[PDB]
């Protein structure tokens, strides 16, 4: 049996079609050494943070909250323009949200599905076909947001502006 993603390599033994974004892609066999379900949970959390981060790098191009209206549209400067009381409140809120993952991982590790923090308020994923599609879509949009945020971060390092601004001014290359 060979891997779907890299057809000339053998299939990575510890990933399976059961996993939503499975492509058979583990050329360096991380799952051969680390727990596949731990890696699965880490990829989903990184994707969820990145999906918000990719929207966050883009969104104050359009509109800013009135209090932070004076803040810069380059995200890497608006990071330092926020007060430490504000960053402390963000860190506390992320801490409160992360207590549930600290309780899921490290205590009931084997009970559930990777990334399942009991957050389904609109009762989606009830229909099985919808649940299948949403599982794969969350993984794929999370991976895309990881790549996209990685891009936009380094683009803000080179051109000292945000994504849309760099595009509009056509500042695509190191000046």
């Amino acid at each position: 049996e060979m891997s779907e993603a890299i057809p000339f390599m053998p299939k990575p033994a510890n990933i399976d079609s059961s996993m939503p974004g499975y492509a058979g892609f583990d050329p360096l066999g991380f799952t051969d050494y680390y727990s596949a379900k731990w890696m699965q949970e880490a990829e989903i959390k990184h994707g969820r943070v990145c999906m918000l981060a990719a929207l966050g790098m883009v969104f104050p191009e359009f509109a800013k909250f009135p209090q932070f209206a004076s803040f810069s549209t380059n995200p890497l400067e608006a990071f330092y323009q926020v007060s430490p009381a504000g960053w402390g409140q963000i860190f506390l809120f992320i801490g409160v949200l992360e207590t549930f993952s600290y309780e899921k991982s490290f205590y009931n590790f084997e009970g559930g599905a990777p990334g399942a923090l009991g957050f389904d308020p609109l009762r989606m994923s009830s229909n099985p076909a919808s649940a299948k599609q949403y599982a794969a879509a969350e993984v794929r949009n999370g991976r895309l947001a990881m790549i996209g945020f990685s891009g936009m971060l380094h683009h803000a390092i080179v051109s000292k502006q945000g994504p849309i601004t760099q595009i509009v001014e056509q500042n695509f290359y190191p000046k």
Partner: protein, 175 residues
């Protein structure tokens, strides 16, 4: 008949769908779901029939609460931002409710709908079966025509900048 007699007829295009003249050279329906493609074709078609009606009407009529653009495509740019956003969310509401909150190719057809049916016949024009067959063919062909026509009307209005009927009554070749 075969639309492209030199090419072999596509294998999945059986005559059951209306408007089938065996025209799929590029080779869709060999990769994608024909239910999805047909529902997409009717959606594009019905949108474009309303779109060409909108272009022709807005070239003449204007609601008193709205400004008037030079052309019906410049009519988009004098309607308040909130108005465009309200129409967008209203259409989104329709798209959610009419499709049973199942909007992706993985789940849109998992309840067994036929492509393009929303149970929409208040006047009961589809009461007759054979008349329904004829109007199915009429709908898909007028929809295809309105797709092309909308492309033509929009690009000519962008190019000349003088409407559709005004363009015809004041035709001025490319110089």
């Amino acid at each position: 008949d075969n639309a492209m007699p030199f090419l072999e007829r596509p294998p999945k295009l059986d005559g059951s769908l209306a408007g089938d003249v065996g025209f799929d050279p590029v080779g869709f329906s060999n990769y994608f779901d024909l239910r999805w493609l047909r529902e997409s074709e009717l959606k594009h078609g019905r949108v474009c029939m309303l779109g060409v009606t909108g272009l022709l009407v807005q070239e003449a009529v204007c609601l008193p609460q709205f400004s008037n653009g030079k052309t019906p495509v410049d009519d988009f740019f004098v309607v308040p931002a909130a108005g465009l956003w309200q129409v967008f969310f209203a259409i989104g509401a329709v798209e959610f409710f009419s499709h049973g909150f199942k909007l992706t190719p993985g789940d849109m057809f998992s309840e067994g709908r036929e492509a393009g049916d929303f149970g929409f016949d208040p006047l009961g024009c589809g009461k007759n079966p054979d008349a329904l067959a004829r109007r199915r063919l009429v709908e898909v062909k007028n929809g295809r025509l309105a797709m092309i026509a909308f492309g033509g009307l929009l690009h000519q209005q962008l190019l000349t900048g003088q409407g559709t009927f005004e363009q015809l009554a004041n035709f001025k070749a490319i110089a």
